[PDB]
UniProtKB/Swiss-Prot annotation:
<protein>
    <recommendedName>
        <fullName>Serine protease 1</fullName>
        <ecNumber>3.4.21.4</ecNumber>
    </recommendedName>
</protein>
<keyword id="KW-0865">Zymogen</keyword>
<feature type="disulfide bond">
    <location>
        <begin position="116"/>
        <end position="183"/>
    </location>
</feature>
<keyword id="KW-0645">Protease</keyword>
<feature type="binding site">
    <location>
        <position position="57"/>
    </location>
    <ligand>
        <name>Ca(2+)</name>
    </ligand>
</feature>
<feature type="disulfide bond">
    <location>
        <begin position="148"/>
        <end position="162"/>
    </location>
</feature>
<dbReference type="InterPro" id="IPR001314">
    <property type="entry name" value="Peptidase_S1A"/>
</dbReference>
<dbReference type="InterPro" id="IPR050127">
    <property type="entry name" value="Serine_Proteases_S1"/>
</dbReference>
<feature type="binding site">
    <location>
        <position position="52"/>
    </location>
    <ligand>
        <name>Ca(2+)</name>
    </ligand>
</feature>
<feature type="binding site">
    <location>
        <begin position="171"/>
        <end position="172"/>
    </location>
    <ligand>
        <name>substrate</name>
    </ligand>
</feature>
<feature type="binding site">
    <location>
        <position position="62"/>
    </location>
    <ligand>
        <name>Ca(2+)</name>
    </ligand>
</feature>
<feature type="disulfide bond">
    <location>
        <begin position="25"/>
        <end position="41"/>
    </location>
</feature>
<keyword id="KW-0479">Metal-binding</keyword>
<dbReference type="InterPro" id="IPR043504">
    <property type="entry name" value="Peptidase_S1_PA_chymotrypsin"/>
</dbReference>
<comment type="similarity">
    <text>Belongs to the peptidase S1 family.</text>
</comment>
<dbReference type="GO" id="GO:0007586">
    <property type="term" value="P:digestion"/>
</dbReference>
<comment type="subunit">
    <text>Interacts with SERPINA1.</text>
</comment>
C-alpha cells in the first residue's frame, strides 16, 4: 500500500496473509473455512495466516492454518487477468472472534464514488521498494467505469473496476495482491493489477466480487 496509513493491530479482522515460507499475497476470510484471493496468487503449499499484524513477529492473535485445496475461477485468464479470483479452503476451521472475523459477500455491486478500505502488506513505495511489517490501509473511492477504461484502453472487462486516485500517490501495490477492497462492510474487490503503483492516471484495478457471488456460494456448498 502506497500513501496509506498503519491500520492498527487486528483492526481489519478478515485480512489474511498467504504464506509459502514468506508472505506472498493477501486474502479475505469469508467464513470459518474459506478465503477469497486473486487467481494470480495461485500456488501449491499455501499456509493461511489469520489474526496477523506484524507478519514477522508472533504477537499473540495469530492462527496459522494450511490450505487443503485451492479453486481458481474456471474462466481465469492469466494474460488479461479476467476473472482474477480464487477460493482457498482451510484444513481446519478458523476460530472466529473480534480479531479474526469473516467479511460479508455483497448482495449488490457497489457504485462509482463509494468509499472503500483497501489493505495489505505490499510495497509502500511508488518508485523504490520498502515492505512494511505491519498491515497498511488506504481509504479510496471506486472510480467510474468510463474513467477506468480511459486509464487502461482495451484492458478493463466487466469483471474489473478501478479504485483510487487519478492524481497518483495513493494505491495498492505488489504484495497487496489478492487482498480486500471492502465497501460499507461488504467485500467488493480483490487487489488484482495496475501499471506500477500510485502512478498518475494509473489507478488500481480490482476484481469485481459481486459478479462471483453465485460461483462462490455454489463452490463453497459442494467443496
Ligand atoms: N494497484 C496497483 N497499482 C497494483 C496492484 C497489484 C499489482 C500486482 N502485482 O503482482 C505482483 C505481486 O503482487 O507479487 C500491481 C499493481
Ligand atoms: Ca504476527
Amino acid at each position: 500500500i502506497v500513501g496509506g496509513y498503519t491500520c492498527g493491530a487486528n483492526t481489519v479482522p478478515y485480512q489474511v496473509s498467504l504464506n509459502s515460507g514468506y508472505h506472498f499475497c493477501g486474502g479475505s476470510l469469508i467464513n470459518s473455512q474459506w478465503v477469497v484471493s486473486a487467481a494470480h496468487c495461485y500456488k501449491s503449499g499455501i499456509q493461511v495466516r489469520l489474526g496477523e499484524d506484524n507478519i514477522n513477529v508472533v504477537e499473540g492473535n495469530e492462527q496459522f492454518i494450511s490450505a487443503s485445496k485451492s479453486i481458481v475461477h474456471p474462466s481465469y485468464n492469466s494474460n488479461t487477468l479476467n476473472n482474477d479470483i480464487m477460493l482457498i479452503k482451510l484444513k481446519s476451521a478458523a476460530s472466529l472472534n473480534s480479531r479474526v472475523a469473516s467479511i460479508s459477500l455483497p448482495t449488490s455491486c457497489a457504485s462509482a464514488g463509494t468509499q472503500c478500505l483497501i489493505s495489505g502488506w505490499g510495497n509502500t513505495k511508488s518508485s523504490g521498494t520498502s515492505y512494511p511489517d505491519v498491515l497498511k490501509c488506504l481509504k479510496a473511492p471506486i472510480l467510474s467505469d468510463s474513467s477506468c477504461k480511459s486509464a487502461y484502453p482495451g484492458q478493463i472487462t466487466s469483471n474489473m473496476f478501478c479504485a483510487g486516485y487519478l492524481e497518483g500517490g495513493k494505491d495498492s501495490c505488489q504484495g497487496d495482491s489478492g487482498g480486500p477492497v471492502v465497501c460499507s462492510g461488504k467485500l467488493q474487490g480483490i487487489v488484482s493489477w495496475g501499471s506500477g503503483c500510485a502512478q498518475k492516471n494509473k489507478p488500481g484495478v480490482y476484481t469485481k466480487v459481486c459478479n462471483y457471488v453465485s460461483w462462490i456460494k455454489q463452490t463453497i456448498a459442494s467443496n
